[PDB]
Amino acid sequence: IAIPVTQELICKCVLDPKNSDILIRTELRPEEVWLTWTDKNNEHHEKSVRQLAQEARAGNAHDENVLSYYRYQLKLFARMCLDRQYLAIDEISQQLGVDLIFLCMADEMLPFDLRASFCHLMLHVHVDRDPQELVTPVKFARLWTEIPTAITIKDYDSNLNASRDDKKNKFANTMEFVEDYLNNVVSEAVPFANEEKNKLTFEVVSLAHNLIYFGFYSFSELLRLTRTLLGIID
């Protein structure tokens, strides 16, 4: 459970601009993302995340170390954005947008642990905010006019969409990525064999659960996802 006092103190201390050096900065440029970091000395190094992963697979010690540092920084940011702590959620959102996080998430060449960290950051930063709120799947008060003479799956989905507040969906790409990843996982002979893949699977399933409880999915999409989830279990 998040501790508001220490969390706020750490937010104030870490996000202080005077401590901007200790944090690696990721920038999206024409479309690839580059990480820029300052070593213990007053020197700056900028390199592509894909290149960092390539050399880490090769066996470079410094590149692996900086990748691990970035992963732990992402974990710290995600922990800082727990229980809707906005003083840091806004800073992370401005520093890290939806598009950049999704780009880092979808790519498969990057290590699984980093993808899981990005998924956790996405869940704790953007999924849970003011516009999103828990929705009861069953409602007891129904207007006489709103009842349709003929009801089907498509009509029910249209009614749910009408009930939805935001016409524009910022997580459609995330939802498609989640569906594709779950389909790929169920396609695997062993759903839970690789330790690294298990963490990413846990992050994506948690993201799907939180999106579902927030009403982001339609009935047809939920029904389709049901079979894939059951195949994942067994």
């Binding site: 003011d130 709120e133 009861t136 799947p137 069953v138 409602k139 007891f140 008060a141 129904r142 207007l143 006489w144 006019t145 009842i147 349709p148 003479t149 003929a150 009801i151 799956i153 029910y156 839970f192 298990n198 963490k199 699977t201 846990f202 399933v205 948690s206 799907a208 659960h209 579902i212 409880y213 009935f219 939920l222 029904l223 996802l225 049901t226 079979r227 989830l229 059951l230 994942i232 279990i233 067994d234």
Partner: protein, 206 residues
């Protein structure tokens, strides 16, 4: 991690089943409305439709419900207590679809009268505004926000109404509108002693 993801999937499946129950209730309401409008612009036909809706398309698994049962039985054998409890609950609730559907349908509220529609609209707006204000509690723990909250509380208090015949309907509508949850969440807001506006709004909520 495997147990955690399995538990999350179980929760997702429970939500899916709840949505299916909601769709079934909507189907019953639509059939009843169609029958009423056709006959009075019959019982056997609607009964046959209701019996037939229960298990094709509204299937949790493509195997006709078998795969769900095998998955639940397999999960019940795991050592993780929460997973076993969830699997047992889902298995028990899987064979009580008709009972749950009828129980949910028995509590359906229509709000036919225009006055009922106006009450629903105003109550929904006030509850949404109150919940939005409650979410941003830190912004007004210690401005016009207090006046807005007081006005919303007074409007809801007036909406409660008078008269037993009207009071029963108003209370039923409020209960169906999930006002208790938001009001109790407001009551749980952190407070500092000595803020007169705060005890005033607390008394209004009480």
């Amino acid at each position: 991690v495997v147990m955690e993801t399995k538990l999350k999937i179980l929760e997702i499946l429970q939500f899916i089943l709840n949505v299916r129950l909601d769709y079934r209730i909507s189907y019953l309401l639509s059939v009843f409305k169609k029958e009423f409008v056709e006959v009075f612009p019959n019982l056997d036909r609607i009964g046959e439709q209701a019996e037939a809706m229960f298990g094709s398309m509204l299937e949790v698994d493509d195997e006709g419900g078998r795969m769900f049962l095998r998955v639940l039985i397999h999960l019940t054998m795991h050592d993780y207590a929460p997973l076993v409890s969830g699997a047992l609950q889902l298995l028990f609730k899987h064979f009580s679809q008709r009972q749950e559907a009828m129980h949910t349908f028995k509590q359906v509220q229509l709000l036919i009268s225009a006055q009922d529609v106006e009450n629903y609209k105003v109550i929904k707006s006030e509850l949404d505004r109150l919940r939005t204000m409650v979410e941003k509690s830190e912004l007004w723990v210690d401005s016009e926000n207090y006046q807005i909250v007081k006005g919303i509380l007074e409007r809801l208090n007036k909406m409660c109404g008078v008269g037993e015949q009207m009071r029963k309907k108003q209370q039923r509508l409020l209960k169906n509108m999930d006002a208790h949850k938001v009001m109790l969440d407001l009551l749980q807001i952190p407070y500092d002693k000595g803020d007169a506006k705060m005890m005033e709004i607390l008394r209004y909520t009480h």
